[PDB]
Amino acid sequence: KMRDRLFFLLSKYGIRPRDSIGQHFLIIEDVIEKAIETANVNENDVILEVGPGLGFLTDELAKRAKKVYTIEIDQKIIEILKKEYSWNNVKIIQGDAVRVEWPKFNKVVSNIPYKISSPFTFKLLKTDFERAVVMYQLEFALRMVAKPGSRNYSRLSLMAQALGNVEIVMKIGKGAFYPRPKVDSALVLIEPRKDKIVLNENLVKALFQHRRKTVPRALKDSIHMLGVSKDEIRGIINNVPHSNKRVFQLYPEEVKDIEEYLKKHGIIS
């Protein structure tokens, strides 16, 4: 039905879904409505969307929001959106959403290109926004909610828990997109944590390079590779708090204790 509208638009502009940048388009109308009501889009909201595709999500956002900014990398899609729709309140921004400057907004509603799930999320969590409702692959959504000390707890999980309140609203079947992905997706709600734990990105990267390591092994490994000498940092690193944990068992609070200790001992400035 919406699938049919898609097939019509695809053949009309003689374009086929290029899995290059990411082009599994959402074609179930009620998934769109559910995303939008979950974000509570109203006449006061300024929305950011990444990857409008053929504008099915965009069109519904435009009806309810004060203003939509939508970042699209593909100039052909942009031309088609402009020809196909008449919105008063949508600003299309050409570029890679990972690279371009984001406008100010209070909400995000997006079917994210799954290839930028990871950088997109880290950028978002660094933003001031009230609420984000975003579609991801299910495994990635589950990684975002992973608990310290689970197998799939990673840098993403830590930063999500440090900076956000994250919730899987529902799973979404393969059948909801064209073309079909071979894994279920998930609709995810993110709000800023009221009591954010701001962590040093270099530290986390260093620690989570190899998240299976004990925290001492990890720390010495990562700062020696920067170009430092390890004779220089052995002792200090050795007294590091939470030293009998592996990196994948660390809570944000515990990373923060490591941070402050490293700052106190000169390691991070």
Ligand X SMILES: O=S([O-])[O-]
Identify which of residues 22 and 52 has a Cβ nearer to ligand X in the complex: 22
The stretch near Cl ion (CB under 5 A) out of 1-9, 34-42, 70-78, 237-245 is 237-245
Helix, strand, or coil (residue 16): coil
- CA distances in angstroms from 26 to 111, 166, 181, 204, listed in the order given: 7, 22, 11, 34
The answer to whether 72 contacts Zn ion (rule: CB under 5 A) is no
The answer to whether 79 contacts Zn ion (rule: CB under 5 A) is no
Instruction: Report, in Å, the least distance between residue 37 CB and ligand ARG.
Output: 8
Beta-bridge partners for 89: none
The answer to whether 58 contacts its own copies (rule: CB under 8 A) is no
- 164-172 and 185-192: which strand pairing? antiparallel
Cβ 93 vs Cβ 69: under 8 Å: yes
Identify which of residues 149 and 179 has a Cβ nearer to ligand SFG in the complex: 179
Q: Which does 111 bind (CB under 5 to 8 A by kind): its own copies, Zn ion, ligand SFG, none?
A: ligand SFG
The stretch near its own copies (CB under 8 A) out of 48-56, 82-90, 180-188, 242-250 is 180-188
Residue 178: closest CA among 61, 16, 70, 12: 16
Instruction: Report, in Å, the least distance between residue 165 CB and ligand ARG.
Output: 5
Residue 252: closest CA among 205, 198, 172, 214: 198
Q: Is the peptide bond before 179 cis (omega within 30 degrees of 0)?
A: yes
- CA distances in angstroms from 149 to 173, 242, 245, listed in the order given: 29, 13, 9
Instruction: Report, in Å, the least distance between residue 219 CB and ligand X.
Output: 16
Residue nearest ligand X (C-beta atom): 181
Instruction: Report, in Å, the least distance between residue 234 CB and its own copies.
Output: 11
The stretch near its own copies (CB under 8 A) out of 44-52, 87-95, 115-123, 241-249 is 115-123
Give Cα 132 to chain centroid, integer Å. 10
Identify which of residues 56 and 136 has a Cβ nearer to ligand X in the complex: 136
Q: Which residues bind Cl ion (CB under 5 A)?
A: 242, 245
